[PDB]
Amino acid sequence: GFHSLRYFYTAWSRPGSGEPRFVAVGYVDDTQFVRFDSDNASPRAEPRAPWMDLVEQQDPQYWDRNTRNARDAAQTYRVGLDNVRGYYNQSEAGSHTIQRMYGCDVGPHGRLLRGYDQLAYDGADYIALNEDLRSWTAADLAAQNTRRKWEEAGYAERDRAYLEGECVEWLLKHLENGRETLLRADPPKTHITHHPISDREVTLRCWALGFYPEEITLTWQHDGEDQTQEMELVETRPDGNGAFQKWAALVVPSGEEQRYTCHVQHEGLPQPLTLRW
Amino acid sequence: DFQESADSFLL
Amino acid sequence: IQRTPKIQVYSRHPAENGKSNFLNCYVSGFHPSDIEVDLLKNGERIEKVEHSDLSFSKDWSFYLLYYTEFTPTEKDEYACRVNHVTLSQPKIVKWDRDM
Q1: How many domains are there within chain C?
Q2: List the disulfide bonds (chain A) (predicted).
Q3: Tell me: domain A1-184, CATH 3.30.500.10, correct?
């Protein structure tokens, strides 16, 4: 198959409200495992997944190493806000955000499929490492400054060396340590609920609960014809226990049930599911 | 591992 | 470049009166990251409320899960109150156990 290690950084300024804040989290596929918050008194890198809280002794220096790396990132982006601000000539009275996402995609053989590093400013693309992991694309003229600084510092090569190196290997170590959580496919618990509106109309809601990974397909049909336009489909939401939820409802006439099949597909299901009231 | 230092860089 | 949050209020497990559960308020698709999320029990703020660590989607918009343990009844109405810079007044979404 394919698995991914992904890191997310958010740094934002808050003028007249203290000094800038920097938060960062790490994910193996769709399951967080680490976090860092610069607002904490003595900010440490903290585990956020069960396999990180008990089998993280293999390396007695993991938490110190990651603590210092995260603190350095915190200072880098804290000053970077001042940089991006100067480039655009923006007033310090305003709040602004730098976001970063980087990581690696590994294939079924355990070798790297693709590495990536992307940065946004105020929620819009700012600068990205190209596919060759050797050059940068800056979205506008202000980001050209960052591109020039990073090229003259030879940053892209150290980026590539992390993405093809420590990233892949730590993805493999995490997949091994947390295979009970990460290498699972929990199928959804599915059912249909029935909510009258009038003597003339009823809502039918198709529920998929407690599934992992996040990807799932939920559709209604009437006698065999899709009803994506008529139905209401909420965005997949987490249940707080490390799994996900989704439902899809449709308004149908009273007595006109027993048509309108619900259809669920998920990689944890042996076969796709068909439910009917 | 978080990617290391950034050698005190500056966007 | 600002984006208003979407809100969903729901329980971790199907609603069963008199049994312990987790009340969830999921806010997503918003920007910038500062956001105020309160959980209400009959119109009043719940003290013991925690939230997930800040993250974001491919379009760079943020999402968060606020949650608290509760045991629902027939009479107890629960809700989520969300304010953000893009919202001129705070939005309130009641907890519907059928959603």
Answers
A1: 1
A2: 104-167, 206-262
A3: yes
Distance CA A189, CA A275 (A): 12
Q: How many whole angstroms from its chain centre is CA A100?
A: 12
Residue range of the domain that includes C42: 1-99
Q: Closest Cα to residue A193, out of A184, A202, A185?
A: A202
User: What's the full length of chain B, in residues?
Assistant: 11
Cβ-based burial of C97 (10 A; exposed 0-12, middle 13-18, buried ≥19): middle
- What technique was this entry resolved by? X-ray
Q: Which two tokens stand for residue A179?
A: 């295979």
Give the number of C-alpha atoms closer than 13 A to the C-alpha of residue C17, restricted to the C-beta side. 5
PDB resolution in Å: 2.4
- Using DSSP, state whether A119 is helix, strand or coil: strand
Closest chain C residue by Cα to residue A193: C98
- Our CA-based measurement puts residue A83 at a distance from the nearest CA of chain B, in whole angstroms, of 6
**Phi-psi label, residue A162: left if phi above 0, alpha if psi -120 to 50, beta otherwise:** alpha
CATH number of A185-275: 2.60.40.10
Distance CA A206, CA A187 (A): 15
- Report the residue of chain B nearest A28, measured CA to CA: B1
Half-sphere exposure of C88 (CA within 13 A, CB side): 0
Please tell me if residue A83 touches chain B, with a CB cutoff of 8 Å: yes
A199 half-sphere exposure, CB direction, 13 A CA radius: 0
Q: Residue A153: its chain B contacts at CB < 8 A? A: 7, 9
Go through C10-48 and write b for each residue having 16 or more CB atoms within 10 A of its CB, e for each that does not. Answer: bbbeeeeeeeebebbbbbbbbbbbbbebbbbeeeeeeee
Which of A257, A248, A252, A247 has its CA nearest to residue A203?
Answer: A252
Chain A nearest-CA distance from C49, in A, is 13
